[PDB]
């Protein structure tokens, strides 16, 4: 049993127009990997979409959910998924070797730039006070020219 959910790049719809159910529904790296596993070890596989869409975790009580609860209830005995190995998960099921070693990072967009416009130079001073500068110079000119002529 493969309890699973739609997850790139692991679980993607196998590109076909046909009405498909079970193993031939999906395409992915782990899909052909599971084909290889059923080949070499001689078993076979069944792929099932999980209802709640969960890895599996105890609640505030201790009730496991998701694919881990599908494993513990023995309705599933494998769960092909990006399953992170943690020790609380270790004391419910049996993890294999680390086959995709990784770690959590942070992703965000690329702003990486500004628009320091000619509009933007005014900002530490009020535009009416920017006008007061101009009108003060005009007042100085119109007094001193009356002084001149």
């Amino acid at each position: 049993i493969v309890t699973t959910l739609l997850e790139e790049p692991f679980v993607m719809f196998r590109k076909s127009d046909r009405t498909l159910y079970g193993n031939d529904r999906f395409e992915g790296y782990c899909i052909d990997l599971l084909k290889e596993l059923a080949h070499i070890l001689g078993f076979s596989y069944e792929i099932r979409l999980v209802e709640d869409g969960k890895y599996g975790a105890q609640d505030d009580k201790g009730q496991w959910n998701g694919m881990v609860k599908e494993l513990i209830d023995h309705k599933a005995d494998l769960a092909v998924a990006p399953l992170t190995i943690t020790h609380v998960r270790e004391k419910a099921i049996d993890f294999s070797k680390p086959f995709m070693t990784l770690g959590v990072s942070i992703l965000y967009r690329k702003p990486n730039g500004t628009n320091p416009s000619v509009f933007s130079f005014l900002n530490p001073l009020s535009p009416d006070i920017w006008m007061y500068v101009l009108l003060a110079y005009l007042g100085v000119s119109v007094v001193l020219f009356v002084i001149a002529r």
Binding site: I93, V104, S105, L107, Y108, V140
Partner: protein, 187 residues
Amino acid sequence: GGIWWFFTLIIISSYTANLAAFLTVERMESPIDSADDLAKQTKIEYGAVKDGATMTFFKKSKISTFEKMWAFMSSKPSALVKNNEEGIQRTLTADYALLMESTTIEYITQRNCNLTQIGGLIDSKGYGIGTPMGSPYRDKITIAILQLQEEDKLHIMKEKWWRGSQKIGGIFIVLAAGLVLSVLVAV
């Protein structure tokens, strides 16, 4: 003229003071490349997937930066995303970075060129295949893992399936206006 000369000195020193103030705001605001930034900022939300082993591990944090992160993320349950796509669209649209594992972030930033890695990885952590407690076929799984890695199918197919698919210059126009302004004076 001494009065007006002093007056315009007050004017230019005042706007000089305010412009220097904003420059220092920009310079103290110059850029952030570490987690400690989110430990110091407050205006950028950040969250994690519910039933995420990442979120469970942030509950188990014994790192002061990451513990303040867990305290804020527990204070903001809207940051605790249900699916990835909630955090994805909030990262696309709003001021919101997201904690996620290296391989998936890597495969998306290779696909989506709109993105970049923020900071680095936390530590090393791997994937496992869970047989239930008492089912011995995990050892066959282990033999097949040692096989297909030692047969180099895992690394080569991991390579294959993961396809990598001015205010500096703002014043010179106002300067060049005087070139044509001097034409229309006398001749």
